[PDB]
Amino acid sequence: DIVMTQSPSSLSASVGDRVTITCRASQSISVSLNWYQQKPGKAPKVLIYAASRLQSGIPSRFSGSGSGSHFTLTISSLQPEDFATYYCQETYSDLMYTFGQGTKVEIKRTVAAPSVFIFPPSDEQLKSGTASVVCLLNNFYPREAKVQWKVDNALQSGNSQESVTEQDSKDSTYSLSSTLTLSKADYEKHKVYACEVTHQGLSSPVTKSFNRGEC
Amino acid sequence: EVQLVQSGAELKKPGESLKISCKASGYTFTNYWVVWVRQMPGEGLEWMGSIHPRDSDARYSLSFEGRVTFSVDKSTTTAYLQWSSLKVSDSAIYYCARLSQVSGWSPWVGPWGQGTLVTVSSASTKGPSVFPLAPSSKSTSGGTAALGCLVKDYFPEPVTVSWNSGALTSGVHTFPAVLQSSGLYSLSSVVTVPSSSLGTQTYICNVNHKPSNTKVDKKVEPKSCDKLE
């Protein structure tokens, strides 16, 4: 029963860096080993089969090496679109073709400040008795960002949630939503809704605000 | 073109049976193994086993053998994965895929189906509300304006969002769904466009939530706010 141990579980590298991912088998498996790339929200795609044979259509910067119980996937010049989780797989067994645990490859890029946009609740949602205010932080790097809500200059807590996209395949940035949700009655008790953003790319925090009623 | 097209996302209760399907096309169905692979969201790939349509030779990984049955329908070139009694722990995406092989080299998996998300839950489905995130000066800078749709209060995953029936894909960010304290999911899909297009171009988000048969097209119209009393 063949166990595939993949390392490291995640790594980060700059565009142009040489990346090395290792896969070890609990017993010798000759060259019966595949490497796959899986991008967020997609099925995996084979890169290499038989340890070293590159699939047609795969860029030459991907290369597989090794035999027996130790295998390596090398990306010679990491590109933004190589952001993905990579998996090895043994096909030495009798159709018991188990995968390694995966290696998440993230791209290091330069600091990039977010564009900050704010959306009041729609009139349609207010009809339904709830108010969601959306603060959007677009195309920033690194992923860490601090988003605070202030309602009539009072700091909010416990009524908002964040979601962050996976790194962009072209520019390697993140985007983030912070959504403040209130009942319509609570929303209509206040006037000034503001999202304050702290981030490495900003010399000081940026606030985007609106006044209830301004449209 | 070799293709495998899987059935849609499923919501089922614990103890129910479920059969999901994988329609093969573009190749000789009885010449290739079909394989099944489980993936919990954000986790790794798990080999479940394989079935060969020529003789319905089925191989199961030990982790799955008691509980799942592979089958095929040769006449419709369709492979099936069946549970007799679902558990909450069966919630995951399930991929079907073809096994491929060059010469005598060891085989690999591909191409792949798009995956079927199975949610096993005691809770009933809830369809989303879709609200516009209207572009305004508050969502505009440098000649670019952001707009979007808020897809709120649904269960289970997934929803799909397209823009202008798929014509608009550049600059789209559909955020991962996040749980509210209600136990329902919510997400926004946003897109950035030239601010000069706002008078000219119509922007419509197409939202689909299969488990609740909810299909909504939402026109998102620009707003102008004079900020006066």
Residue numbers in the entry:
A (entry chain B): 2 to 216
B (entry chain A): 1 to 229
Please share text taken word for word from the publication where this structure appeared:
Here we sought structural insights into the human immune recognition of fHbp, a key antigen in the two licensed MenB vaccines. Antibodies to fHbp elicit protection through complement-mediated bactericidal activity. In summary, we present here the crystal structures of an fHbp-specific human Fab in free and antigen-bound states, elicited by vaccination. We define a molecular signature that allows a vaccine-elicited human mAb to cross-react with the three different variants of fHbp and importantly, to induce complement-dependent killing responses against MenB strains harboring fHbp antigens from variants 1, 2, or 3.
